[PDB]
Design a protein around this nucleic acid. Structure first.
Ligand SMILES: [Mg+2]
Ligand SMILES: [Mg+2]
Ligand SMILES: [Zn+2]
Length: 590
DNA sequence: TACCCGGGCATA
DNA sequence: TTCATAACCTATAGATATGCCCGGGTA
RNA sequence: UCCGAGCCGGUUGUCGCGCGGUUCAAUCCCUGGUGCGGGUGCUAGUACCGGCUCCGCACUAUCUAUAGGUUAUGAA
């Protein structure tokens, strides 16, 4: 929530030059990464193995037991009965997975904090994935079975007589989702394909709530839908449809950020006994290894360091925690008109795929922030090319390209995937252990900060010290993140509808004479260009009304830039709203 | 034999 | 039309610390 | 599979102009920015006051993991 914030700095600046502490941190994070990866893989293996009888009720205890068995094995001695039962149930499968992958127990001491963090993170990932995408995948399967993609081509489009099927589907889903209780007579009207789909959906054993819809049930207790979600994945694999990651495997070999709190310095880094450490204040203890006088550790908006960082070997994210922590169409300009009138200057912004921002003012001054500029400043393209060159030189591409899909729900296929991953684990681990990846991430962060700061500085220099931002509500290229950026710089941002803003000429206010796609040219994309394809120009528009024309023009139409027209029409709309006349009729929906 | 500290485990 | 590895956008959830028991060495 | 940004024209408020001319910005290393004092230096004319670079006071900037779409690459 609002009670927490983060400041990201370099590894060298955050920590003192004592090499022992840095080496201990680097060693600890590497062990934690492997533990998390193998825990996720073992959880998936156990789920697939138990699929023979029933999908288990996965809780925090399951992942915690998997982690402990990987780290300690039989040496784990839980006190409570539930954890002991989980240990007894998971030990054989964990040992079998270790044999398959050749895992060697690290026997790391003092793993409580890291194990708790990893268990919480993995359960959060499971919950988020299931909650967010169970409905999406179910509806996607429903559409795929009925060939809705091909049904448009099979039937003549835009015909009332053919609307029956697309209406029939709308009803079937309501029966399948338990949204509407079907009448008994309708059950006998199902065609064989519909009956098969109904049986397949029934086999999923989807939970249900009588008082609230299925969507509310998913949010209320998303994890209860996990057993069905996995089943759904299997259905895909039965029909060859594009599969999805049912279980969130943690596969990346690059060093992931690992959390470090006061306890981790307590035990692993400083290696001081708990009794001795309890006699020292937290701030001094952290100062013994960290330069808290650095800029990154300063208080902001009443927040304080409070001993919490995340490190990956190249960058350190220090978390500032407010003292009051838990400790265990509002955005549209229509509703914000009163605030707009007090702005010194008003900026109207149109987003586009290429021109990420196209900004204009009432005084006519224009500005833009394009995709190419963002790519160049951020360095994404250069880093991508260098990474591709490294992969080509090391030959890792041939190894990764042949890896069997990890989304399979069959035990044999998952075992084959694990064997293939083990076969070349050593080479890829060394390749991704290179400092290039974390350094690239840190440099990308710095470049993004620089680019955003330069953008804000240029906007202030062109449009004044303070101004209000009005942006279109279109979204697909950065689309919705900008709303946050202006907030970080204390610049107001408001939304505006783009309906037909690109089909009206501001100088005659008549949409009947607007020309679209009046010229064609060889395709801009080189691979499409060599293919012989031709592209219609989208951003160029024409006006044919005589009032906008002149006798000295042989073209016969006044030319306009699409972004310029959009910004001018949006400025006119804003002026009309501020004048009390509301949205102009021409741009109004109906 | 019995005492102590350091470390592992539980949990809001 | 299917798979794998980076990343870019969007969205979700989470962002430690104190007490109790045991085991290893010592008296 | 490639594309930096501003200005003057072909231009009329015109293009993923693979049209021309024209100005500076980055291509490695780097957490970013704002306001207040001095502290060598480098620059423009006789203490005036423009820039680059540090010192120090407070003012400020949300990261991690996972999943969906896409991009780039490598296989069919
Ligand atoms: Mg638009
Ligand atoms: Mg546009
Ligand atoms: Zn017109």
């Amino acid at each position: 929530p609002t009670l927490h914030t983060c400041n990201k700095t370099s590894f060298a600046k955050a920590f003192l030059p004592n090499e022992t502490y840095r080496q201990r941190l680097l060693d600890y994070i590497a062990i934690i990464h492997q533990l998390a990866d193998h825990a996720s893989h073992a959880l998936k293996f156990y789920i697939l193995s138990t699929s023979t009888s029933s999908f288990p009720v996965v809780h925090e205890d399951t992942i915690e037991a998997i982690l402990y068995l990987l780290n300690k094995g039989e040496a784990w001695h839980p006190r409570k009965e539930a954890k002991k039962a989980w240990r007894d149930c998971l030990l054989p499968y964990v040992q079998r997975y270790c044999q398959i992958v050749g895992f060697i127990h690290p026997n790391l001491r003092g793993e409580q904090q890291s194990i708790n963090y990893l268990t919480v993170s993995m359960m959060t990932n499971l919950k988020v994935n299931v909650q967010e995408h169970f409905m999406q995948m179910l509806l996607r399967y429903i559409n795929l079975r009925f060939d809705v993609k091909g049904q448009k081509q099979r039937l003549p489009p835009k015909s009332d007589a053919r609307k029956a099927f697309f209406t029939r589907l709308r009803y079937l889903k309501s029966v399948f989702l338990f949204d509407v209780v079907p009448e008994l007579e309708f059950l006998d009207d199902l065609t064989p394909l519909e009956s098969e789909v109904l049986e397949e959906i029934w086999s999923l054993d989807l939970p249900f709530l009588p008082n609230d819809p299925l969507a509310y049930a998913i949010v209320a207790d998303p994890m209860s839908f996990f057993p069905a979600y996995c089943k759904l994945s299997g259905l895909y694999e039965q029909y060859g449809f594009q599969r999805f990651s049912a279980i969130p495997l943690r596969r990346s070999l690059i060093q992931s950020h690992v959390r470090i709190d006061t306890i981790i310095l307590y035990q692993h880094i400083l290696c001081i006994t708990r009794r001795d450490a309890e006699t020292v204040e937290k701030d001094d203890l952290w100062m013994r290894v960290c330069n808290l006088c650095t800029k990154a550790f300063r208080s902001r908006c009443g927040m304080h360091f409070e001993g919490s960082i995340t490190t990956d070997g190249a960058s350190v994210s220090v978390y500032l925690k407010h003292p009051e922590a838990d400790k265990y169409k509002a955005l549209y300009v229509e509703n914000n008109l009163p605030a707009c009138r007090a702005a010194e200057n008003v900026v109207v912004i149109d987003p586009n795929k290429r021109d990420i921002l196209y900004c204009q003012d009432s005084n006519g001054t224009t500005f833009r922030y394009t995709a190419n500029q963002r790519a160049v400043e951020t360095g994404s393209r250069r880093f991508a090319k260098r990474r591709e060159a490294m992969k080509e030189e090391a030959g890792v591409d041939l190894i990764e390209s042949r890896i069997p899909s990890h989304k399979t729900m069959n035990l044999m296929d998952f075992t084959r995937y694990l064997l293939v991953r083990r076969a070349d684990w050593d080479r890829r681990k060394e390749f991704y252990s290179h400092p290039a990846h974390t350094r690239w991430k840190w440099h990308s962060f710095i470049n993004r900060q620089k680019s955003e700061s330069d953008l804000i500085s240029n906007m202030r220099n062109k449009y004044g010290e303070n101004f209000t931002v009005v942006m279109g509500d279109w979204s697909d290229s950065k689309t919705k993140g900008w709303r946050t950026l202006f907030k970080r710089n204390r610049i107001d941002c408001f939304l505006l509808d783009e309906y037909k803003t690109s089909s009206v000429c501001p100088r005659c206010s008549s949409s009947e004479f607007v020309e679209k796609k009046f010229k064609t040219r060889p395709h801009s994309r080189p691979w499409r260009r060599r293919e012989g394809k031709i592209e219609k120009v989208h951003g160029l528009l024409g006006c044919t009304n005589p009032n906008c024309l002149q006798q000295a023009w042989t073209s016969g139409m006044r030319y306009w830039n699409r972004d310029m027209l959009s910004t001018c029409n949006m400025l006119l709309i804003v002026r009309s709203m501020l004048d009390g006349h509301g949205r102009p009729e021409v741009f109004s929906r109906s």
